[PDB]
Amino acid sequence: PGVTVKDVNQQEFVRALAAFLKKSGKLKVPEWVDTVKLAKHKELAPYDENWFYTRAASTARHLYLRGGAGVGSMTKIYGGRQRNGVMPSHFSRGSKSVARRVLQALEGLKMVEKDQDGGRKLTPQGQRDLDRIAGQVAAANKK
Amino acid sequence: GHQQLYWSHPRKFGQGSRSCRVCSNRHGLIRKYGLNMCRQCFRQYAKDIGFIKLD
Amino acid sequence: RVQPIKLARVTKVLGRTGSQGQCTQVRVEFMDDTSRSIIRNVKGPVREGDVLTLLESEREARRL
Amino acid sequence: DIKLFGKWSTDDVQINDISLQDYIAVKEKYAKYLPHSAGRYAAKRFRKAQCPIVERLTNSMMMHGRNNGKKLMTVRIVKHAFEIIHLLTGENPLQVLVNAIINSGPREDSTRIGRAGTVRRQAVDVSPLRRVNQAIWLLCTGAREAAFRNIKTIAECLADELINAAKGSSNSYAIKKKDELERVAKSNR
Amino acid sequence: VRRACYGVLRFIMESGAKGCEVVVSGKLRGQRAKSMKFVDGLMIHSGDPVNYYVDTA
Amino acid sequence: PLQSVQVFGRKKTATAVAHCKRGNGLIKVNGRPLEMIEPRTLQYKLLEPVLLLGKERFAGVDIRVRVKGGGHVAQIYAIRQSISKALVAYYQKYVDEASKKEIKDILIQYDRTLLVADPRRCESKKFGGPGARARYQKSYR
Amino acid sequence: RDKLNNLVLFDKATYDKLCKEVPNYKLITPAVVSERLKIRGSLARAALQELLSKGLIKLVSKHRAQVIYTRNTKG
Amino acid sequence: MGRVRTKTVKKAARVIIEKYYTRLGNDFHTNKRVCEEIAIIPSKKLRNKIAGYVTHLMKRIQRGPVRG
Amino acid sequence: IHRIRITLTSRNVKSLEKVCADLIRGAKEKNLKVKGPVRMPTKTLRITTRKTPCGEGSKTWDRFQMRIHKRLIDLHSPSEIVKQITSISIEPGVEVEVTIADA
Amino acid sequence: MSLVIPEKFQHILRVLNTNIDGRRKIAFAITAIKGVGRRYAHVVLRKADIDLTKRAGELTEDEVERVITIMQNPRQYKIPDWFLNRQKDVKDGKYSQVLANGLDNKLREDLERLKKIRAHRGLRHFWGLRVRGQHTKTTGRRGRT
RNA sequence: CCGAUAACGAACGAGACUCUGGCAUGCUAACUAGUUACGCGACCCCCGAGCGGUCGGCGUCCCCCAACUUCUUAGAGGGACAAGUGGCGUUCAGCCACCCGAGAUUGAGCAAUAACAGGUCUGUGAUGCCCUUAGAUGUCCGGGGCUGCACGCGCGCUACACUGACUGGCUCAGCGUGUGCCUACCCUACGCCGGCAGGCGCGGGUAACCCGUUGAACCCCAUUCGUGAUGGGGAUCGGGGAUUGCAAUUAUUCCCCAUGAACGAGGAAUUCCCAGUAAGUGCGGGUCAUAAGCUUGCGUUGAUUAAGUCCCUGCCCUUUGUACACACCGCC
Ligand SMILES: [Mg+2]
Ligand SMILES: [Mg+2]
Ligand SMILES: [Mg+2]
Ligand SMILES: [Mg+2]
Ligand SMILES: [Mg+2]
Ligand SMILES: [Mg+2]
Ligand SMILES: [Mg+2]
Ligand SMILES: [Mg+2]
Ligand SMILES: [Mg+2]
Ligand SMILES: [Mg+2]
Ligand SMILES: [Mg+2]
Ligand SMILES: [Mg+2]
Ligand SMILES: [Mg+2]
Ligand SMILES: [Mg+2]
Ligand SMILES: [Mg+2]
Ligand SMILES: [Mg+2]
Ligand SMILES: [Mg+2]
Ligand SMILES: [Mg+2]
Ligand SMILES: [Mg+2]
Ligand SMILES: [Mg+2]
Ligand SMILES: [Mg+2]
Ligand SMILES: [Mg+2]
Ligand SMILES: [Mg+2]
Ligand SMILES: [Mg+2]
Ligand SMILES: [Mg+2]
Ligand SMILES: [Mg+2]
Ligand SMILES: [Mg+2]
Ligand SMILES: [Mg+2]
Ligand SMILES: [Mg+2]
Ligand SMILES: [Zn+2]
């Protein structure tokens, strides 16, 4: 009888943390979240009116596992194939000032924190919120 | 001469300012690890530098 | 009209025939008259001791 | 006992033809949960015969170069196609698959040396492994060509290939090119 | 060329060598080049032992 | 408190070293449980030794596996012989050999790869073509 | 086979045909009912899931590449 | 297949049989150790490939008079 | 008494395993607390060349490589008695480099 | 998944000078308009408050007119300046999104601009050749005999 | 190889050897690699749980305030030899099956004689003769060309889609390079500004130390799409924004918004390939101020078929025929 975020479904866990940050309307959403494309190795800015909450959810959840990740490490996680038209594809890294505006959006929500080394970790205020709703996901997976 | 335009074109970057240390040639050069030799003059001194063709 | 499909076990494999070496020779029995035996030529991998599936029979073979 | 894919038992299926009982590979000993295994069945001749027939079906479905190493994509394709067989018929698909290997492997083929105006020359018997090699090959080609630009998904065209092949209709791609081989072999017997 | 390269060859072998092979190539007399080699005794050619049994020049 | 062996298993690069203490039925990989592991079409290949041996064999141990290297599919197989050599090696040191011999003859008679690894790594690439054996197209004229 | 071009937001002669005879037979898939009547392709992913609001359709697989449905339980 | 021995293995084992027959037997792992005691073999793969042929001759010259 | 680190780099291992074993028993005889020879991963240097002086041929490449072996010994010794331990085994393929303790 | 069908389900539309398809989804129907692509249509339907699951035969003309009103002059509705087609017009200085035969004009007005100036890029439009530094030795044998 | 034997004793090549892949819970050792223990510090169920669960959070070289070496690294040895068993064989050399085992043929490196008018004088201060030497074919500077296009051919890349594109989420690698005598040009963490390419600050790394636990792609999970030259395909083309540089036009590369061409799986031909192989899929290295549709390496997912043959294309040995020896592209 725990539980934490490790022993639940990681993909469903995000859909719940994105909804948890939705109704608690203190997450500062920037003013260009509906016209930005999200990391130039892909076209067509996403099929979601509020994709910023799912990106802020997974980023927060990614900081719970490997701490100390800055803005360059979060561009590495959310990168993929850039199909170069007629040339072969390549891994090209993600977008810088959409991962920074996520990590700055949680500095005001008191979930992330600058470190002695670089990057950001979860404050003890922060993983209190992730581990609590992890019990909410596992309570629904028995039903 | 004269001094202002005898060698005035800048021999910075580019294979016009990289020469083989043995034969002073500018084609087919190996600059990896600071060899700075041509690809044929490397094969003369391949063992004398100490590279071994193992496989 | 057609002859019933008669099965047949295979004795010794007798080498490879056919221009490109695709077909063997198998010298089958019939499992009904086991005293009776006819050499034939299958294609594909054989493994002496298996069971074939012959249609019509009284065919041919040329001994290699 | 083992319930392949978690839900399909295997100690009830019957092989029709006495010939193919050592090359069709569903029964008691080597019946696994999944059709994915680090095989090592290519290192020796006839080692691929004790390879289970559901493993062999997934290995021949990932073939046109577009999708050539994608095995975990064709694990679920055979998984979905078995649930369609269950709904279309109401029977264990391990039974339906082994009734399709019987009714699609040719019993006669043709090849030898000289002239070939249409196919080949001499009527040649078929060993009971090539007709397991080729029966899987015909069912994986009828599934692939039916769904090449059709609305139908690949697990539908895999099910509708061998629901219609295990029945025997000459309305599937497999029996259409199983009786095409033995008709032309009956021609130049 | 011939008279000299004999004297080198039977100087190598008399100095305790196990085998020798001296190859002289180029414009030997005339215009077309040919090659005179002078193998005698024992000469390994392949493997790792042609790294420390045979010294070349 | 020292009843704890740690063995490993590999598949093409990926070593996965288990660890079984003396405990109560716990089994998990990198913190994630045995069922919440990756791509899940290969799930019956990773909880495979737990099924046909049983739960009472795993009832006394605490399997904990850490996995590095490899890919997604050659990680399911690394754990597959990691959690199943950890039960074999635990039963030769702390219970009798007759109980190990009757579960080794389960894990060998059904998929021998559960206790021995495949020696196939990867062949080297040559200067003839794009890969190990394959060669570049040749134009005669 | 020349052209298909048919159906979007069902006409009433097929929607009344939808809600009666499609929960009757065995294999229900958005690819087999699209070719069946005339429903384009998307409708069948959208129509067959709101028949799980009415409950005349039992779910089987629910995968991202194929959603297999069936007739409702009779016995 | 393809493991026919050469004559750096065969004629270097007939010297071992003719000179050291009392110190040997029909056991590979012992004659592998006798052969490196009585011979300077420069490599390990040539070592136990001679001794694999030494044991083939001693299940052989305990039946008839093979050379010898 | 310091905590010094000797580093031994070479291109052949059989000429380095003799020098590195000389420094171990050379300081076990002089009763020092010696952490053992720690072996770094080797560094292969793999220049590959076209092998032809011209461009004509059947495209046969030429794989040269040179491994570099690096081993390090950590001592518990003052600055004086290590100098006669250091200066007794040169063996020119080995480049003995002694670092400083505090750093 | 509608009730049955919209009663005023309009079968095609007619917007600027093109007849967009009514059966397409609205973010991909209006890409038949030249000057409006897949990236520009998805942002002018976020400036309008309409959902995108509707097709092009369900937008009422109180909503169709605003879709034309956004795309005709996008810069006054906070669509950012890096997103347009004709930014810094070579004859106006005005960032503008051409979306009509004015796109076909601007294309043609700049080709004959470079020919009237007689620059090197304009001569390779008057001649049926490649402009962007391509090699013509072994490429372009379809548009010419 | 065994044998045969007017031959006897040898030699190179083949093999051995070298490197590499697989195996060692045995050895040597590891604050520039760790692993378990244990101590604190966070969270989660709690009524309070607990030798509870999670943690790449912290610490055990300011002298113990803990030991070890499975995983990692690389040293020294072992290990596999047709050895054991059965079958066929002159019961010879050997072959096939089988047991036990990590493995019962892992891949390459080196490589003989005799040749060739094979390629290279544009690799060389390797070089013969010849040519040219001040209005120079020396050398430098500025501009242009090597890339120009009715067409033919060769190696490739991307495609023709639903076994897919799209969007979001999830989740694993291995080789390897990195501040340069001249020589200017290094890999880059983190913080902030910008939509993006990028910019400005502050560091670490001459490297198992920092980039880096190399959060690689395909794959996987969910949504949208729906057989339509379509949300397949991204050629052509306009406008704009940056970076490298002394200089970007004949577009260096990159980013953005538009333009949306053939192409529906390919005629006669023909090329590679049999196991971690083909193929898919990305990442390094070389070139590099700027840069990979090339090549050289690396992992990753991972098959179909075959364990044969001399039919085609050739090769090796023997007998035989020859008017061939410039040797059948012969001679006539
Ligand atoms: Mg990614
Ligand atoms: Mg289809
Ligand atoms: Mg030799
Ligand atoms: Mg050799
Ligand atoms: Mg490859
Ligand atoms: Mg510490
Ligand atoms: Mg200490
Ligand atoms: Mg170890
Ligand atoms: Mg010539
Ligand atoms: Mg030359
Ligand atoms: Mg000259
Ligand atoms: Mg050169
Ligand atoms: Mg010039
Ligand atoms: Mg050129
Ligand atoms: Mg070529
Ligand atoms: Mg596209
Ligand atoms: Mg690594
Ligand atoms: Mg289109
Ligand atoms: Mg210029
Ligand atoms: Mg260029
Ligand atoms: Mg575009
Ligand atoms: Mg590059
Ligand atoms: Mg090139
Ligand atoms: Mg062969
Ligand atoms: Mg032939
Ligand atoms: Mg010839
Ligand atoms: Mg005659
Ligand atoms: Mg003659
Ligand atoms: Mg004539
Ligand atoms: Zn040179």
Domains along chain B? 1-55 (4.10.830.10)
- Four-residue CA torsion sign, B42, B45, B47, B48: negative
What is the residue whose two structure tokens read 């105006």?
D117
CA-CA-CA-CA torsion for H11, H13, H14, H18, nearest 10 degrees?
150
- Delimit the domains of chain C by residue range: 1-64
Best CA proximity match to G70, nearest among G62, J31, G60, D152: G60
> Which CATH number does the domain J12-77 belong to among 1.10.8.50, 1.10.3720.10, 3.30.750.24, 3.40.50.2000?
1.10.8.50
Cβ within 8 Å, pair D34-F44:
yes
DSSP string, chain B: --TTTSS-S---SSTTS---TTT---SSEE-GGG--EETTHHHHSHHHHT-B---
Nearest to G32 among D80, D83, D156 (CB): D156
Residue burial D89-128, b: 16+ Cβ < 10 Å; e: rest: beebbbbbbbbbbbbbbbbbbbbbeeeeeeebebbbbbbb
**DSSP 8-state assignment for residue D20:** G
B38 close to B48: Cβ distance less than 8 angstroms: no
Domain boundaries, chain H: 2-62
Burial class of residue A103, CB neighbours in 10 A (0-12, 13-18, 19+): buried
Q: Where along chain G do its domains lie?
A: 1-75
**Strand K bases, protein C-beta under 7 A:** 1-3, 11-25, 28-32, 35-38, 42-45, 49-57, 61, 63, 70-76, 78-84, 92-96, 102-103, 105-115, 117-120, 123-124, 126, 140-142, 147-159, 161-164, 166-178, 180-185, 188-198, 208, 212-213, 215-228, 230-231, 233-241, 245-246, 249-260, 262, 264-265, 270-283, 285-290, 292-311
Q: Please name each of the domains of chain F with its CATH number.
A: 1-141 (3.30.230.10)
Secondary structure letter of residue F114 according to DSSP: G
Amino acid identity of D180? E
Instruction: Give the contacts of A45 (CB within 8 A, at least 6 positions apart).
Output: A34, A35, A36, A37, A38, J39, J42, J43
Find the CB nearest A43 among J38, J43, J46.
J38
Q: How far is CA C31 from CA A13, C7, C24, D105, D131, in A?
A: 65, 7, 21, 22, 21
SS3 state of residue J144: coil
For this PDB entry, the determination method is cryo-EM
Q: How far is the CA of H24 from the C1' of K3 (A)?
A: 27
- For residue F123 the two structure tokens come to 């062949």
Q: What is d(CA H9, CA H33) in angstroms, rounded to the nearest whole number? A: 16
Rounded to 5°, angle at Cα I44 from I41 and I50? 165
Buried b (16+ CB within 10 A) or exposed e, D161-184: bbbbbbeeeeebbbbeebeebbeb
Q: How is domain G1-75 classified at the architecture level of CATH?
A: Orthogonal Bundle (1.10)
Is A44 in contact with J43 (Cβ distance < 8 A)? no
Q: How far apart are CA I68 and CA F121, in angstroms?
A: 25
Whether chain I has a CB inside 8 Å of the CB on B39: the answer is yes
For residue J131, whether the previous peptide bond is cis, meaning omega lies within 30 degrees of 0, is no
Two tokens at E1? 């060329």
Interaxial angle between packed helices J38-47 and J61-72, expressed in degrees from 0 to 180 and rounded to the nearest 10: 120
J43 touches chain A (CB under 8 A): yes
Closest chain I residue by Cα to residue B48 = I66
Q: Is B15 annotated as a binding residue?
A: no
Residue with nearest Cα to nucleotide K297 C1': F125
Number of Cβ within 10 Å of residue D84's Cβ equals 26
Calculated CA dihedral for residues A126, A131, A133, A137, nearest 10 degrees? 150
Q: What number of H helices and E strands is found in chain H? A: 3, 0
Which uninterrupted H or E stretch holds I74? Answer: strand I66-74
Structural domain count, chain A: 1
State which residue of chain J sits closest to A31, comparing Cα positions. J78
Q: Where are the alpha helices (DSSP H) in D60-178?
A: 73-88, 93-102, 130-146, 154-167, 173-176
- Report A:11-40 residues touching F (Cβ under 8 A): none
Q: Between vectors from CA H24 to CA H20 and to CA H26, what angle results, nearest 5°? A: 140
Locate all alpha helices (DSSP H) within E1-57, ordered by sequence.
Answer: 2-12
For chain A, what's the residue count? 143
Q: Are J35 and J97 in contact (CB under 8 A)?
A: yes
**CA-based radius of gyration for chain B:** 15
Separation between the CA of A42 and the C1’ of K252 (whole angstroms): 25
Residue whose CA is minimally distant from K106 C1':
F123
Is residue D134 a contact partner of residue D142, using CB atoms and an 8 Å limit? no
CB J20 within 8 Å of CB J35: no
Query: What does the alpha-carbon distance between residue A41 and residue A30 come to, in Å, rounded to a whole number?
Result: 22
Centroid of ligand 30 to alpha carbon of B39 (angstroms): 6
Q: Residue G30's closest CA among G56, G51, G12?
A: G51
| Physical contact, B and I (3 or more Cβ pairs within 8 A) | yes
- Beta carbons within 8 Å of A76's beta carbon, 6+ residues apart: A93, A94
Resolution in A: 2.9
C1'-nearest nucleotide to the CA of F22: K51
Q: Is B20 annotated as a binding residue?
A: yes
Say if A86 is an interface residue toward chain J (CB within 8 Å).
no
3-state secondary structure G16-63: HHHHHHCCCCCCECCCHHHHHCCCCCHHHHHHHHHCCCCCCEEECCCC
- Taking the domains of chain D in order of start, what are their residue ranges? 1-189
For H2-62, give the CATH class.
mainly alpha
- Which tokens sit at D86? 């269950």
Partners of J25 in beta bridges: J55
Q: Is B23 annotated as a binding residue?
A: yes
CA dihedral over H34, H37, H38, H39, signed as positive or negative: positive
Of F11, F45, F110, the CB nearest to D36: F45
SS3 label, residue A10 = helix
SS3 at position A129? helix
The Cβ of residue A9 has, within 10 Å, a number of other Cβ atoms equal to 15
Helix axis angle, F82-93 relative to F97-107, nearest 10°? 160
Q: Quick check: bond before I69 cis, omega within 30? A: no
Which H/E stretch holds residue A76? helix A71-77
Q: Is B17 annotated as a binding residue?
A: no
Q: Are the beta carbons of J66 and J48 closer than 8 angstroms?
A: yes
Give dist(CA C31, CA C7) in Å, integer: 7
Question: How far is the centre of ligand 19, averaged over its atoms, from the C-alpha of J124 (Å)?
Answer: 21
Give I-chain residues touching B40 at CB under 8 angstroms.
Answer: 53
Put simply, whether C51 touches D (Cβ < 8 Å) is yes
Q: Which residues pair with A113 in a beta bridge?
A: A121
Q: Which nucleotide is nearest to H63 (CA to C1')?
A: K91
| Residue A38 domain boundaries | 1-143
Distance of CA H25 to the CA centre of its chain: 10
Distance from CA of F58 to the nearest CA of D (A): 19
CA F16 to chain centre: 7
Compute φ and ψ for I73, nearest 5 degrees. -125, 130
CA–CA distance, F47 with F25 (Å, rounded to integer): 13
CA separation for the pair D41, D23 (Å, rounded): 13
Cβ distance F65 to F79 under 8 Å? yes
- Sign of CA pseudo-dihedral F7, F9, F15, F21: negative
